[PDB]
Design a protein around this nucleic acid. Structure first.
Lengths: 82, 80, 255, 94, 98, 491, 91
RNA sequence: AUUAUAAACCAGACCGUCUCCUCAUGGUCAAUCAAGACUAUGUAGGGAAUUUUUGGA
């Protein structure tokens, strides 16, 4: 299967940041991962390009409209590869 | 830049690649995981901005990329 | 000294065509009252070409009586069959089942043939016992051709066999060098054979292609089923019977 | 396997492509459209499923106007491969 | 179409030379030759001359080289290794042992 | 025998051996050596020796620093050798063997030497093979072919052929080798599971199977038919049972077909044939004619062997017994009739002088004459036969005239060649319907009704045997053809 | 069938691909994918003559391309209509 | 005692020397009461219209 998906799944319960089409970045917990890259978060920070930053409780994001997703450095070599 | 006649994506895995997106925001990062969509996980992210001249910098993450809005991938400087 | 022989023989084996430049028999007088046998200088030559200098190589032979004289036996077909040859003795496979092939129209099992290196006027234990084993009650009247071979000359020594011999054979196949003595030169009844090129003939050879199982010792099965194609029979030390040597060489002979 | 896709071969000649198939068969000039203010002309040669097309003797016609104007730039192109998503309207002219 | 040109026009003109060995017998003659080679070689390498030698055969080569090795070892091993070899030695290690 | 030459007449020509020499850049000396040393009764042992003797090895000598390696080898080296260590020939032969078996070396002098062999073995061997073929000598040429193959693909005969695919794995090949199974058996096996079971590796079984239906293999059949006493057609039927692959099998798959004798000593006739992708699977024929030897003609064998072998695929070599049981040849070609000197027969002798005005000459041809009396005067059957050039046409015309003479009419000229039939019709209707008093000449068309109508009407019909045959068949009802009277079966 | 099968054959040819956002990039095609992913060894650039932004080795996502031009000027096409038929040998 | 270096035949233009992904295929393994990673076939498909590669410039 696709390894990035697997990696994402593995990192369920990590402080994952985000960046969308518009550039509305985020940084909260990873709640769940799927084959299509649909994500849900907790205690999520909203830091948009507009400037008006806010603090939100939960948020769910569409996978298709993602540019990329941030991950910590722990799952780098192991255990996902071999 | 020092990069040879590399035939395919699997033969150039784990290289420090420039990556390009739809809006124009340029990247740099070490290639980790090939994919169907080219959702290429980078070892470290440093995205760069140009206003609508001159290039800026960021450093937030070490990212799982998503392929939809990518343009193409270019080698910068190999490891080891 | 076990390596010195085979290689030498193989090298020697190049001089086997020459062994039929000269061919002669101390010709015994002819008798219509028995069946007289017709062998072709072609088939014989081929057999000699295959043979070893030292060793018993030994096919079956086949054919049938022509309508000219129903006493005659035309030897149209060698049937080179699986075997493991010793020096002056030979293991051999079954009477070959060969109704599968074409040109097997009512071909009687006429007998068999072999090489050796001693011009007797009779059949030895090595031979006689083997013969018995081959043709216990399957065909009593079937005959043997020894071909004595020596540098310069091969000579054909045809032999028949009596029913007392077969009985001996069943018991004394294993060992028994005094039993053969007891039995004697008799009963190797000298049978009538002719050599010709007014006919020619062919081999049946194992469908495998590799009748000599010298170095395929593990494969051989004295009472085993084998297929048989029409084919060009191979030389005794032909690269297909010798596989192990090649393998050894590959497993570098220059370490 | 073989029947399920190859039946769509005649679907070119019946469906809305039929025109462009015909054009391809008997090479004729056609207006070729694009996303960002573009106009292109050429004769048809090789034809596909999804408008990923090839042509010959091609003329691009487009503008780079830095200040409320029109500058119809023109350059000859030959033996291209336009990705069919970009194509919008094509039509056979007499 | 013809264009003869001599050593006159050579990039590095051939400064020719000869030895002229007086001795005859092979077992001494060879020795003499070796000595001559050494003497020439010594003269050369002092001036920073990286040198080629030919011989006749393959078997001759190694024996000549060996002899040479067991000639300069007496007088001066220094002037063929010369350099301090912190990187040079590494380089040598990399290719000589493989 | 590289050329043909006459000292005084001064006429040069190139032989096959000369050609061989040219192509395979032989030094004439080498060629000469080959010519004598290759021999009806040469053997594998000899063949290597002969190769060694090749005079692009005049300068190769044994060397002390090599010697040890040679010693190590020459014991275990699997071609027996006639020479002994110091001889350079022996060394060469052992190097060849090494190359065949892939024995890359430590003491590189040998390796340098072996490099030469590698670049030039396949050449020399091929040349030798060609020479053998030319000669017509089975023993070497099959062996020589094998040798050539080995040279090409660096492995021996006993090294299992899979080896020569790029994609099969190392463990499998080893397993195959030791196991001492007749390779063909593996090929024969049907199920990939079965293959797996019997490749000491249930892993990769499917892969190997795929790589056995990727291997060349032909259930060839061939019956010959004796054209005449000397001549023998041989109808071959070659099936190509394997599945092609443009990486593996190449642009085409050559197969040097031999026909060879009951012994396997002599080639009779040979041919290269390229099996192409296109061919494979199609039951595809191939024919050739072979004359015979006087003795052979007299007393003939129980068989020959027709024998495809690939110019690549190890242990391909499909040999089959060209059945001959009771191939009772014909009686020595019956004799042609004699031409007597009596050409006096001419446009005079024919009765009414109307018929004289049709021929654009006066006196007939030599052969035309010899038959005329039987042809024109008498009303009985005629076989002419020959000859091409000479007027069959004239004879036909004469016959027609004769038929007309007795008031018969119903003529049927049957040549096959319709495009010449048409021509005949064109230059008959103009030269003939006039002079009879209206005798109607018609070339038959295609469709049967029309033809029937023509028959009913027309006096002379011309027809392609096909068409006229079609017309006739229902003759018990179509009573026009019941009442046909003369038939000029042309050709 | 498909016109991506056209570019499947063309191994190692020089092209200056017009991408959708607008670019000029001289490079060797190598092997193209059935999703139009080509692999480009040597490159010249234009970021949004046009200025050389100093990159060498690109690998294309097949979505990006508008027009490919100037590898070779030929017309050779079909393949699958041959292969389906010559495999019908025995039933 | 003991020998320089060096080039080489043959099948090819009427012809797809060579694929990144998913699905099936039989042969395997790693396994729990009916499911996952590997070689291998190309015989399948890739505007599955929206979660990517065929249109939000």
């Amino acid at each position: 299967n696709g390894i990035p998906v697997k990696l994402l799944n593995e990192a369920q319960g990590h402080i994952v940041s985000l960046e969308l089409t518009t550039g509305a970045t985020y940084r909260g917990k990873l709640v769940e991962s799927e084959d299509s890259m649909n994500v849900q978060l907790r205690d999520v920070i909203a830091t948009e390009p507009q400037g008006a930053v806010t603090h939100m409780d939960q948020i769910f994001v569409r996978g298709s409209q993602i540019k990329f997703i941030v991950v910590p450095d722990l799952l780098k070599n192991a255990p996902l590869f071999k | 830049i020092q990069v040879a006649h590399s035939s395919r994506l699997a033969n150039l895995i784990d290289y420090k690649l420039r990556v390009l997106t739809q809006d124009g925001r340029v990247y740099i990062g070490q290639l980790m995981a090939f994919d169907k969509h080219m959702n290429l996980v980078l070892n470290e992210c440093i995205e760069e901005r140009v206003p609508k001249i001159k290039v800026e910098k960021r450093v937030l993450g070490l990212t799982i990329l998503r392929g939809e809005q990518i343009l193409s991938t270019v080698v910068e400087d190999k490891p080891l | 000294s076990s390596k010195n022989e085979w290689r030498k023989s193989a090298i020697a084996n190049t001089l086997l065509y020459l062994r039929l430049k000269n061919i002669y028999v101390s010709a015994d007088d002819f008798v219509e009252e028995q069946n007289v046998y017709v062998l072709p200088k072609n088939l014989l030559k081929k057999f000699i070409e295959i043979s070893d200098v030292k060793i018993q190589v030994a096919a079956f032979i086949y054919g049938m009586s022509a309508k000219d004289h129903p006493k005659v036996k035309e030897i149209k077909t060698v049937v080179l069959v699986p075997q493991l040859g010793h020096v002056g003795s030979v293991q051999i496979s079954n009477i070959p089942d060969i109704g599968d092939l074409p040109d097997t129209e009512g071909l009687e099992l006429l007998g068999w043939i072999h090489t050796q290196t001693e011009e007797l006027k009779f059949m030895a234990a090595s031979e006689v016992a083997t013969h018995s084993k081959l043709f216990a009650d399957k065909k009593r009247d079937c005959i043997d051709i020894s071909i004595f071979s020596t540098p310069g000359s091969v000579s054909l020594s045809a032999y028949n066999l009596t029913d007392e011999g077969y009985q001996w054979g069943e018991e004394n196949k294993d060992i028994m060098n005094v039993l053969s003595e007891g039995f004697e030169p008799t009963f190797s009844t000298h049978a009538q054979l002719l050599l010709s090129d007014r006919i020619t003939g062919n081999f049946i050879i194992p469908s495998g292609n590799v009748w000599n199982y010298t170095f395929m010792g593990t494969a051989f099965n004295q009472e085993g089923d084998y297929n048989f194609k029409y084919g060009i029979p191979l030389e005794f030390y032909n690269e297909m019977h010798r596989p192990v040597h090649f393998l050894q060489f590959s497993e570098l002979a220059g370490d | 396997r073989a029947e399920l896709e190859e039946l769509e071969e005649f679907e070119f000649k019946h469906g809305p492509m039929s025109l462009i198939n015909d054009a391809m068969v008997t090479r004729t000039p056609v207006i070729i459209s694009l996303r960002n203010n573009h106009k292109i002309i050429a004769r048809v040669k090789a034809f596909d499923r999804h408008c990923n097309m090839v042509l010959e003797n091609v003329k691009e016609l487009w503008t780079e106007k830095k200040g409320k104007n029109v500058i119809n730039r023109e350059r000859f192109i030959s033996k291209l491969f336009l990705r069919g998503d970009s194509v919008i309207v094509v039509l056979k002219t007499p | 179409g013809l264009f003869y040109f001599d050593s006159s026009f050579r990039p590095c003109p051939l400064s020719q030379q000869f030895c002229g060995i007086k001795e005859r017998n092979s077992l001494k003659k060879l020795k003499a030759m070796n000595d001559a080679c050494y003497e020439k070689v010594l003269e050369s390498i002092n001036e920073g001359n990286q040198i080629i030698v030919f011989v006749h055969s393959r078997k001759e080569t190694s024996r000549t080289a060996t002899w040479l090795k067991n000639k300069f070892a007496e007088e001066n091993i220094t002037h063929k290794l010369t350099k301090n070899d912190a990187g040079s030695k590494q380089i040598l290690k990399t290719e000589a042992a493989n | 025998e590289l050329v043909l030459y006459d000292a005084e007449n001064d006429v040069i020509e190139a032989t096959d051996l000369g050609n061989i020499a040219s192509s395979f850049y032989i030094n004439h000396a080498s060629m000469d050596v080959y010519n004598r040393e290759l021999d009806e009764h040469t053997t594998q042992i000899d063949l290597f020796r002969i190769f060694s003797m090749s005079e692009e090895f005049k300068y190769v000598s044994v060397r002390y620093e090599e010697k040890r390696e040679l010693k190590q080898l020459l014991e275990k080296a699997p071609i027996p050798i006639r020479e002994d260590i110091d001889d350079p020939l022996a060394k060469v032969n052992v190097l060849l063997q090494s190359y065949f078996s892939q024995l890359k070396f430590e003491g590189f002098a040998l390796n340098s030497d072996i490099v030469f062999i590698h670049q030039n073995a396949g050449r020399l061997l091929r040349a030798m093979f060609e020479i053998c073929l030319k000669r017509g000598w089975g023993h070497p040429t099959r062996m020589l072919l094998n040798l050539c193959k080995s040279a090409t693909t660096k492995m021996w005969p006993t090294n299992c052929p899979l080896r020569q695919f790029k994609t099969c794995p190392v463990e499998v090949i080893k397993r195959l080798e030791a196991s001492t199974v007749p390779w063909g058996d593996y090929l024969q096996l049907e199920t990939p599971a079965e293959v797996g079971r019997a490749i000491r590796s249930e892993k990769y079984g499917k892969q190997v199977y795929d790589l056995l239906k990727r291997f060349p293999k032909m259930s060839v059949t061939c019956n010959a038919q004796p054209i005449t006493r000397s001549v023998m057609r041989f109808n071959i039927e070659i099936i190509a049972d394997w599945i092609w692959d443009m990486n593996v099998h190449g642009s085409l798959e050559p197969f040097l077909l031999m026909l060879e004798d009951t012994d396997g000593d002599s080639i009779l006739y040979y041919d290269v044939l390229f099996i192409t992708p296109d061919i494979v699977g199609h039951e595809f024929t191939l024919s050739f004619t072979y004359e015979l030897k006087q003795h052979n003609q007299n007393n003939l064998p129980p068989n020959f062997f027709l024998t495809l072998i690939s110019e690549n695929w190890w242990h391909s070599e499909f040999e089959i017994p060209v059945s001959f049981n009771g191939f009772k040849l014909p009686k020595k070609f019956p004799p042609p009739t004699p031409l007597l000197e009596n050409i006096s027969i001419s446009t005079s002798e024919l009765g009414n002088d109307d018929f004289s005005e049709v021929f654009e000459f006066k006196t007939f041809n030599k052969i035309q004459s010899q038959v005329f009396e039987s042809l024109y005067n008498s009303n009985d059957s005629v076989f002419v036969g020959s000859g091409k050039g000479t007027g069959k046409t004239a004879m036909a015309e004469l016959a027609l005239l004769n038929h007309w003479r007795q008031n018969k009419g119903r003529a049927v000229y049957i040549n096959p060649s319709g495009e010449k039939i048409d021509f005949l019709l064109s230059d008959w209707n103009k030269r003939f319907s006039h002079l009879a008093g209206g005798k109607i000449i018609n070339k038959l068309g295609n469709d049967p009704s029309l033809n029937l109508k023509l028959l009913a009407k027309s006096h002379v019909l011309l027809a392609t045997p096909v068409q006229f045959e079609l017309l006739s068949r229902r003759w018990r009802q179509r009573k026009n053809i019941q009442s046909l009277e003369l038939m000029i079966y042309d050709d | 069938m498909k016109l991506v099968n056209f570019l499947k054959k063309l191994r190692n040819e020089q092209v200056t691909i017009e991408l959708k956002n607008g670019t000029t990039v001289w490079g060797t095609l190598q092997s193209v994918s059935p999703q139009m992913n080509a692999i480009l060894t040597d490159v010249k650039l234009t970021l949004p003559s046009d200025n050389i932004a100093s990159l060498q080795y690109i690998n294309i996502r097949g979505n990006t391309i508008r027009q490919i031009i100037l590898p070779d000027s030929l017309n050779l096409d079909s393949l699958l209509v041959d292969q389906k038929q010559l495999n019908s040998l025995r039933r």
